[PDB]
Amino acid sequence: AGGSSPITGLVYDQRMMLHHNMWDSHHPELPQRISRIFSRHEELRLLSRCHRIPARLATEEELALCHSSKHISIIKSSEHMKPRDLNRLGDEYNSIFISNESYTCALLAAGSCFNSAQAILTGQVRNAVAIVRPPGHHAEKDTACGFCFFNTAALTARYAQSITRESLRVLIVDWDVHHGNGTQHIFEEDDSVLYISLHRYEDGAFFPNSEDANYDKVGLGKGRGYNVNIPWNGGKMGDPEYMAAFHHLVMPIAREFAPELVLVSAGFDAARGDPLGGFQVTPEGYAHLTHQLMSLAAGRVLIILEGGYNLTSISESMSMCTSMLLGDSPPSLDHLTPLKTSATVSINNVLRAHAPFWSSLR
Ligand SMILES: O=C(NO)c1ccc(C[N+]2=c3ccccc3=[SH]c3cccnc32)cc1
Ligand SMILES: [K+]
Ligand SMILES: [K+]
Ligand SMILES: [Zn+2]
């Protein structure tokens, strides 16, 4: 009564470390990714400031919100498979490794986010951070892809609608350096879930190597205008470019959409130091992206870990985000390189594509 200071949730469970690559212990999608981030939260005295949200398993019925019965069944069967067959099954997909613990970990990643979304939407917490693996955004309705088995962010959007209202407007912002092909396709015809992705594109030569990630992909049917791809070509982008895309595109569209819940597909592989992305976003940059998103949806933001492969970089970057969620003042941008010419070209292409659908851009 009379109001109270908002609460930030945090979910992290050591069981999700059990998923591993038994043939290549140096695969970039390391168990230590989540434990290193969690450990960094302890060092910075952030953990004791958060309300700890328990993990749980997703149910098979919940997985069916976005995935086919065949795909659920095949991944489910892998918990009991012998080593020879786990390799063959993983090799049936584009860049997937599987262990006997993989299925359970994917359930825990989804269920952790379901509990966090439920806590946000019932007012137990204002916002939350989800330190989960394996990632989700490359997972399609009928197939796994790119280290992802089930589409955690997409599943969380549908779960939120199931416990509130079907038309509940969910914004998913995907700032992982890779395009979230799976999230886009699930919602491509859906005007109740706005998907905005920023990603390295290089004319379709960057993973996942599909022209579906280009700016002219605006959605289908009633979903026209509700899929916003911001593709980067020719240059290692960093804080200046992401701040410009947010100023000119992400925030105007989002504010016009007026989301009631914000999910962040928060990969940190666009971070300085990341050997898969080649970009230059700093921890302070991620903090400012988080702070701008906190102005939406009455502050109902859920940050879901996706990719990010430099353990030091992801730990500092993700901890910067939680600090913002807790209400700390955003840090000053040390460096401020003039923006790249090619980032303006990309931004202007998206503007000319989405101006027919959004008055805030005209
Ligand atoms: O989910 C990601 N990030 O968040 C993600 C998903 C798939 C890939 C594919 N893959 C790999 C795959 C395994 C180990 C190292 C690499 S390097 C690379 C370069 C160019 C194309 N594919 C590549 C990469 C990243
Ligand atoms: K992305
Ligand atoms: K959409
Ligand atoms: Zn990625």
The active-site residue, picked from 71, 138, 199, 354, is 138
The method recorded for this entry reads X-ray
Residue 29 near ligand 1, beta carbon < 6 Å: no
Residue 12, token pair as written in the block: 């992290």
Sign of CA dihedral 41, 43, 44, 48: positive
321: nearest Cα among 279, 287, 361: 287
Q: What is the DSSP string of 206-231?
A: STT--GGGSTT---SGGGTTSEEEEE
Distance CA 231, CA 215 (A): 6
Instruction: Tell me the three state secondary structure of residue 179.
Output: coil
Q: What is the resolution of this structure in A?
A: 2.7
Among protein residues, the one with the nearest Cα to ligand 1's atom 19 is 276
CA of 105 to the centre of ligand 3 (A): 27
Residue 13, token pair as written in the block: 């469970």
Contacts of 69 (CB under 8 A, 6+ apart): none
Contacts of 231 (CB under 8 A, 6+ apart): 179, 199, 200, 201, 213, 214, 215, 346
Strand (E) or helix (H) holding 304:
strand 301-305
Name the residue with tokens 């398993």: 57
Contact between residue 302 and residue 110 where contact means Cβ atoms under 8 Å apart: no
Distance CA 59, CA 57 (A): 6
Among protein residues, the one with the nearest Cα to ligand 1's atom 21 is 207
Instruction: Tell me the three state secondary structure of residue 169.
Output: coil
Contact between residue 300 and residue 338 where contact means Cβ atoms under 8 Å apart: no
What is the extent of the structural domain holding 322? 1-362
Helices 69-77, 102-121: inter-axial angle, 10-degree rounding? 130
State yes or no: is 288 an active-site residue: no
C-alpha radius of gyration, the chain, whole number: 19
Distance CA 115, CA 38 (A): 18
Instruction: Tell me the three state secondary structure of residue 342.
Output: helix
CA angle 102, 55, 289 (to 5 degrees): 95
Distance CA 161, CA 170 (A): 8
CA of 187 to the centre of ligand 3 (A): 4
Residue 33 near ligand 1, beta carbon < 6 Å: no
Helices 32-43, 311-325: inter-axial angle, 10-degree rounding? 50
Contacts of 51 (CB under 8 A, 6+ apart): 7, 8, 9, 10, 119, 124, 125
**According to the annotation, is 176 in a ligand binding site?**
yes
**According to the annotation, is 269 in a ligand binding site?**
yes
Name the residue with tokens 């599987």: 98
Query: 131 vs 100, 108, 127, 178, CA distance in Å?
Result: 21, 11, 14, 19
The DSSP call for residue 267 is -
Instruction: Tell me the three state secondary structure of residue 11.
Output: strand
Please count the structural domains in the chain: 1
Distance CA 106, CA 133 (A): 7
**What CATH number does residue 5 fall under?**
3.40.800.20
303: nearest Cα among 150, 196, 147, 156: 156
Distance CA 341, CA 237 (A): 11
